[PDB]
Chain A
Amino acid sequence: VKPNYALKFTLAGHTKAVSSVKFSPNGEWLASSSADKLIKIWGAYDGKFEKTISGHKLGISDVAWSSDSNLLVSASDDKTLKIWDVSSGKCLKTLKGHSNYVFCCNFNPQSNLIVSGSFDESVRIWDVKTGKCLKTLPAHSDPVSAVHFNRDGSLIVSSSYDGLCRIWDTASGQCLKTLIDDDNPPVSFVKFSPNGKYILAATLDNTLKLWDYSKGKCLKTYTGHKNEKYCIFANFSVTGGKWIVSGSEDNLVYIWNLQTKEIVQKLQGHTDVVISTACHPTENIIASAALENDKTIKLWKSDC
Chain B
Amino acid sequence: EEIDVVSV
Contacts and interface: CB of A to CB of B under 8 A. Distances in A.
B5 A259 contact: no
Contacts, number: 28
B5 to A, nearest CB: 4
Interface residues of B, number: 8
B2 A236 contact: no
B3 A151 contact: no
A195 B3 contact: no
B3 A194 contact: no
Nearest to B5: A193
Contacts of B6: 193-195, 238, 242
Interface in A153-180: none
B2 to A, nearest CB: 6
Contacts of B3: 198, 210, 219-220, 258-259
A196 B4 CA distance: 11
A8 interface: no
Contacts of A236: 5
A197 interface: yes
Nearest to A198: B5
Contacts of B8: 151, 195-196
Contacts of B2: 259
Contacts of B5: 193-195, 197-198, 236, 238, 242, 258
A210 B5 CA distance: 10
A151 B5 CA distance: 12
Nearest to A219: B3
A220 B2 CA distance: 10
Contacts of B1: 259
A210 B1 CA distance: 12
A259 to B, nearest CB: 6
Interface of A: 151, 193-198, 210, 219-220, 236, 238, 242, 258-259
Given A258-B3, A259-B1, 6 more contacts: A193-B6, A195-B8, A197-B4, A219-B3, A242-B5, A259-B2
10 contacts: A151-B8, A193-B5, A193-B6, A195-B4, A195-B5, A195-B6, A210-B3, A219-B3, A242-B6, A259-B1
